[PDB]
Design a protein around this ligand. Structure first.
Ligand SMILES: *[C@@H]1O[C@H](CO)[C@@H](O[C@@H]2O[C@H](CO)[C@@H](O)[C@H](O)[C@H]2NC(C)=O)[C@H](O)[C@H]1NC(C)=O
Ligand SMILES: *[C@@H]1O[C@H](CO)[C@@H](O[C@@H]2O[C@H](CO)[C@@H](O)[C@H](O)[C@H]2NC(C)=O)[C@H](O)[C@H]1NC(C)=O
Ligand SMILES: O=C([C@@H]1C[C@H](N2CCN(c3ncccn3)CC2)CN1)N1CCC(F)(F)C1
Ligand SMILES: *[C@@H]1O[C@H](CO)[C@@H](O)[C@H](O)[C@H]1NC(C)=O
Length: 728
């Protein structure tokens, strides 16, 4: 009974998930914005104060996008004039405020059109990047020191990533790393001199007479990559008239032999840096521990300490080699690594010793290492109840690896199966964050005697609202293929009736190490289709998917377009057998990798699906980026893997589309999956006499995220699906 979950409720966010976004500022305290105001909270006892009132800035002149307070409390960094760039990058204007004096510091100001700014870890030093160069202020009101002079637009980047490193290597614009002390400043420099440029039209506001041509350096499969060099600088010994001296750390000989990347940069102590490097053929990678030489002011990476990590059946790490977690003294670290049996588990490496020791073991995987103390290491894993799409905080006693204890598993079993965590420095307390299957739950806990301290947010409001609407439910089970277990989730219409046959939409991503089947609670498009339109929305993690070991993950190695397409079709074959699915009305849609998969499934000729939608699909792997594609496909050359590159295109299936109803959507300023890709789909479809539907979106990128265009696509897709199923 009641009204149902509508499209408008999704589009307009009629029902809102509250979060509790804190920021640990010490081992016992943490900032939280309680109604604009900024408060500090004491984790042990729970009291708080106002730290700063927004009324402070009422007459600042610009609206403030974000703020950053220094580690030592003395200053706050105000961010405004936010112009977004790519997924992680942006530009902005920065002012600084002295909290000890009720005033904005107004001289030697951070340049305008600054690309990035970071505090040091301790104190109030600043590093920022402007015009692709690094600058350093020992103090906020003093002049900065120029560190780099090499920086050129679109060509040489110091302290910031270029397009692929942001998107594919670091997941981050920044390429600076302060030492804990804040003494040394490490950075990386990228060279995109002969990296080819992707060009596209940006039409801009109606007022713009002549469209602009956006020109971004972007390596596609097999193309010329950027290069990299690594540098470290002693910010304590800088000078006014004399140029700062950057000391270059070089890659291992086994990297310089060809094209390589820098994938990880973790400082281990005040004078020891860990560097990780990765071959353009990404089955082999080398770590470097580099200690600073007190007297000769240099940095040495002894080859005997090099820790090689290598893959025999695929690529290294899930999306890249994992980060190392170092003990305070920095003579050893912990790391997620694939074991003898192909499952990712925590390993123990002592720095001058050969191999490593697995602490954890079993038919499940560690997702992440979350905290390390003298006594305990903390990690998330999907161990509990053998559910690959569940997540929980565990702690391993480092004196007895067989003493493992679930911290989050039995807290609230029915409501809570998907945890993430946020520890104070030194890990004296942590915030638990449950995402489902129930409404999200934010608690705080104490590590001494794993004590539950305080509920922070329980989403009780939302819970009351949602008791008032015909909400759908999620099934989360598995089916068998190849005598192997594969998990799926179905969102189910209210007042579900096994004795009736419902229409079925297949929500697909299926890119390598993905997982669309899980215990997480969402308010999304699928909620609407199920709630209001009474459509079963199904997701299925088959071959290539992630968090279930490497036998499954690497099945797709050098072979994208194969099994992970075939396994979606089988899942549908199975869902129709089930006697509550109208096999005449089975659709499929997906975004990005999802839409390359949708597209492939539609052009397979299986006859299972009536129709599908592909949004910003890939269509030819040679069109996508070098780092991601080559990780799974290798090089597109006759000596490497040219043939399956050319075999796994969407265009070469055009004819089969002649059997289905297809909707094709892409944005025109997609820097990431280029409109080129859809341009080629449509043309192949046209050259063969297939009618299909299409929709472009001016000036939208891969997220198609402007709110008008978000609302638009989901209306269009709703009409499309609704009428493909004959729904009113
Ligand atoms: C938590 O409560 C205690 C008790 O009021 C606060 O401790 C006081 O804090 C300030 C320093 O910031 C001092 O002026 C007092 O002398 C402190 N008293 C004691 C007994 O410690 C503390 O500030 C509160 N913490 C928060 C988050 O507001
Ligand atoms: C990473 O990938 C390359 C390409 O698959 C592997 O090199 C191949 O090795 C096998 C040996 O059994 C040969 O049959 C292929 O002809 C080789 N091809 C190339 C292009 O070298 C390599 O084995 C992988 N590296 C690791 C460390 O396992
Ligand atoms: O836009 C992208 C990629 C996807 C890729 N990310 C990497 C980080 N990811 C990730 N997932 C889980 C844990 C950590 N990282 C998900 C995929 C980065 N950019 N595409 C790759 C798949 C595509 F379909 F080809 C389009
Ligand atoms: C960038 O790389 C090119 C190689 O084509 C090189 O000639 C140029 O010197 C490099 N720029 C710098 C400053 O490293």
């Amino acid at each position: 009974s009641r009204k149902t979950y509508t499209l408008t409720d999704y589009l307009k966010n009629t029902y809102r998930l509250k979060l509790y976004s804190l920021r640990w500022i010490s081992d016992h305290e943490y900032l939280y914005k309680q109604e604009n105001n900024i408060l500090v909270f004491n984790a042990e006892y729970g009291n708080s104060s106002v730290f700063l009132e927004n009324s402070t800035f009422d007459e600042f002149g610009h609206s403030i996008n974000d703020y950053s307070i220094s580690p030592d409390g003395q200053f706050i960094l105000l961010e405004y004039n936010y112009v977004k760039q790519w997924r992680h990058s942006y530009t902005a204007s920065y002012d600084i405020y002295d909290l000890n004096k009720r005033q904005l510091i107004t001289e030697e100001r951070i340049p305008n059109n600054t690309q990035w700014v970071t505090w040091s870890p301790v104190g109030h030093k600043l590093a920022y990047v402007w015009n692709n160069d690094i600058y350093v202020k020992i103090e906020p009101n003093l002049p900065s020191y120029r560190i780099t002079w090499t920086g050129k637009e679109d060509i040489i980047y110091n302290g910031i990533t270029d397009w692929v490193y942001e998107e594919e290597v670091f997941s981050a614009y920044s390429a600076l790393w302060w030492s804990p002390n804040g003494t040394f400043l490490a950075y990386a420099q990228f060279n995109d001199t002969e990296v080819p440029l992707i060009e596209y039209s940006f039409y801009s506001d109606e007022s713009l007479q002549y469209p602009k041509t956006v020109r971004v350096p972007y390596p596609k499969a097999g193309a010329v990559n950027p290069t990299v060099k690594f540098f470290v600088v002693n910010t304590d010994s800088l000078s006014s008239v004399t140029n700062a001296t950057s000391i270059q750390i070089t890659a291992p000989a086994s990297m310089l032999i060809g094209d390589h990347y820098l994938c990880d940069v973790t400082w281990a102590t005040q004078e020891r840096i860990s560097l990780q490097w990765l071959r353009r053929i990404q089955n082999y990678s080398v770590m470097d521990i580099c200690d600073y030489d007190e007297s000769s002011g240099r940095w040495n990476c002894l080859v005997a300490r090099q820790h090689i990590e290598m893959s025999t059946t695929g690529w290294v790490g899930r999306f890249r080699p994992s980060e190392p977690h170092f003990t305070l003294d920095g003579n050893s670290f912990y790391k997620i690594i694939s074991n003898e049996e192909g499952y990712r588990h925590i390993c123990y490496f002592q720095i001058d010793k050969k191999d490593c020791t697995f602490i954890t073991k079993g038919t499940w995987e560690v997702i992440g290492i979350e905290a390390l103390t003298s006594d305990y290491l903390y990690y998330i894993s999907n161990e509990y109840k053998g559910m690959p799409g569940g997540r929980n905080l565990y702690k391993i006693q480092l004196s007895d690896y067989t003493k493992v204890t679930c911290l989050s598993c039995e807290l609230n079993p029915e409501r809570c199966q998907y945890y993430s965590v946020s520890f104070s420095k030194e890990a004296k307390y942590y915030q638990l964050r449950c995402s489902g299957p129930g409404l999200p739950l934010y608690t705080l806990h104490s590590s001494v005697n794993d004590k539950g301290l305080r509920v922070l947010e329980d989403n009780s409001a939302l819970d009351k609202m949602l008791q008032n609407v015909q909400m759908p439910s999620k099934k989360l089970d598995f089916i068998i293929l190849n005598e192997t277990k594969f998990w799926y989730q179905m969102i189910l219409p209210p007042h579900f009736d096994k004795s009736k046959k419902y229409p079925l939409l297949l929500d697909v991503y299926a890119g390598p190490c993905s997982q669309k089947a899980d215990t997480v609670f969402r308010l999304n498009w699928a909620t609407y289709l199920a709630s209001t339109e009474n459509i079963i929305v199904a997701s299925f993690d088959g071959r290539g998917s992630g968090y279930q070991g490497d036998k499954i993950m690497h099945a797709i190695n050098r072979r994208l377009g194969t099994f992970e397409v075939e396994d979606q079709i089988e899942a549908a074959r199975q869902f129709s057998k089930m006697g509550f699915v109208d096999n005449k009305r089975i659709a499929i849609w997906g975004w990005s990798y999802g839409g390359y998969v949708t597209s492939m499934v539609l052009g397979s000729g299986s006859g299972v699906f009536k129709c599908g939608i592909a949004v910003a699909p890939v269509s030819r792997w040679e069109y996508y980026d070098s780092v991601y594609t080559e990780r799974y496909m290798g090089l597109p050359t006759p000596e490497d893997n040219l043939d399956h590159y050319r075999n796994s295109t969407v265009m070469s299936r055009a004819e089969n589309f002649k059997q289905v109803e297809y909707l094709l959507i892409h944005g025109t300023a997609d820097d990431n999956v280029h409109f080129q890709q859809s341009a080629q789909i449509s043309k192949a479809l046209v050259d063969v006499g297939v009618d299909f539907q299409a929709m472009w979106y001016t000036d939208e990128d891969h997220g198609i995220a402007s709110s008008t265009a978000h609302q638009h696509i989901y209306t269009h897709m709703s009409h499309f699906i609704k009428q493909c199923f004959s729904l009113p």
